[PDB]
Symmetry: C5
Subunit: 140 residues, 5 copies
């Protein structure tokens, strides 16, 4: 299977490398394609292109919204864009958004975004290969 991973230069933490590593751990021969875009608002088309043009069965969308009110609106815009990209291709995009807000300092933020990217990576795996497991875990 093919997974697309779309990250940004805006993000203050590399989430991609740990997503990749988690995916390869769980399914050694799984195919990965990486695309990097400037900002969170560039994520929806890049994800869609990857789903429609590069054969990706699923995509992970990696972003890190800033602290401001304007950044919360940006992320909301991008969130909706991802939802539309998904409805246009009957394919999943797991939105991996870690707000800077969510950590108390840089060291915590680095750890948090990477742990979130790993966890969503696990989910991508389960959605691809073990979608009976997610049912077993239905709500706690």
């Amino acid at each position: 299977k093919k997974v697309g991973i779309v990250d940004t230069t805006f993000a203050r933490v590399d989430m991609a490398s740990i997503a990749i590593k988690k995916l390869k751990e769980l399914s050694p021969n799984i195919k990965i394609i990486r695309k990097t875009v400037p900002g969170i608002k560039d994520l929806p088309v890049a994800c869609k292109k990857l789903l429609e043009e590069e054969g990706c069965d699923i995509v992970m969308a990696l972003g890190m919204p800033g602290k401001a009110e304007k950044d919360k609106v940006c992320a909301h815009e991008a969130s909706l864009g991802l939802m539309l990209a998904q409805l246009m291709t009957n394919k999943h995009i797991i939105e991996v958004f870690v707000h800077e807000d969510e950590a108390k300092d840089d060291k915590e933020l680095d750890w948090l975004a990477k742990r979130r990217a790993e966890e969503h990576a696990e989910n991508v795996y389960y959605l691809l290969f073990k979608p009976e497991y997610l049912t077993r875990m239905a709500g706690k």
Copy 2:
């Protein structure tokens, strides 16, 4: 015959899917049921559309229990919009079953409320499938 798709999450703290399936099978024992579980509420829109367009579901139920934070309301509002888009792209209903965290006073109430709501929306799904004119009798009022 009729097919209902049921999409829920791992994140939610009540299993509403079981509540609704059971309700559905008692009112009409020959309804077909396909289930799909997604990590979170924002993954509900595609999964519902997929079940509608690819698995021949006549209708879908989308189940989730949003959190209480101001950022949970946005995610839920995000998801609800996807659900509405998914429906207009397929001329098929999706019944949204979102039970927010603040809608009950504690955990014990939240579990009971979510149970009640999942059952009630399953009733509505039944009416929409088999007696549409029974919703009209209680229209408005």
Copy 3:
């Protein structure tokens, strides 16, 4: 000509009956089709299905949104759905949303819902038959 009328069970006034009465008043041989959905979020697809599958020329979406901030967010999602539904099918849907916000007490609420269903039903008649009366009334006078 054919009008679709979509209401809810959740609503607290029968607006549908009032719209239908006015409509058959102004045009005795207008064909009417009704569909009742549980809630406001279920309105847009019902409206779109009527427009596209039932040969409705125009549709009236009728609902009675609550007072809560949650009810307002829901109503807003509903209105966007109705707006997208109209663009995908080059057909009008006339929104008759009456928020509990707009009246004091139920007495006035009941009356205002009724009056709105009527005046909008008239607008529907005009769009269908006398679109040049609306032009006369553009910018109020």
Copy 4:
């Protein structure tokens, strides 16, 4: 040749259409002009799109006058999205001529403002249709429709 759709409302407190039409016809005596009136702002988008796709309109003016209330502002935002989606689904412009009641003090000013906004937007229509490169001369020039230009 060259056709303009003008869509307005009965809800509006001021007639903006007559200004826009008069401006268009003085800018281009031969332009074809199509009018349609709807009850309200939420009715604008489908009316606009129908005008573009069914009546062969090259461009449309959507004229709207939202009320003062926060509920009105929500609907205005809903119409605005609608207008924007209509344009995308039919690669044609719709010029949003929305005048809020918040924008003026008194009715005399509301009357003045809405009419001047409609007129300046009518000229922009002339420009998109016949002389788009003029708008390029005016890139970054702080131009305002209604109230006076901000400037660079």
Copy 5:
């Protein structure tokens, strides 16, 4: 790739297009450029889409400057979704270059900020067109357009 569209407005108070154009030609001298100017920020989405679909642009820069009021804030949000929707309908990037007036403390800063953000985004286009593996090198780093890089 060969073709870039640049869409700006008359509303904006700083000419953002010239600096982006200059950057583009500096990095890739033979690059094709096409410009359209619209009145406002809400007119950006369709102009952008037509350039992608009817003028054969590989990518577009959408340049605008939202005003200060909580109503220009809504206009830009509306305009941003439009931009995203235009991108998803085509499978083509539109780089949004919005400089809100609230971000600068006077006009001198705003001229500076808008020009810088435009230039850096123009550099981002270059990479997206020609060197997209470099953006992967800068994945998760401090990168900002206009204001100084935040750092990892």
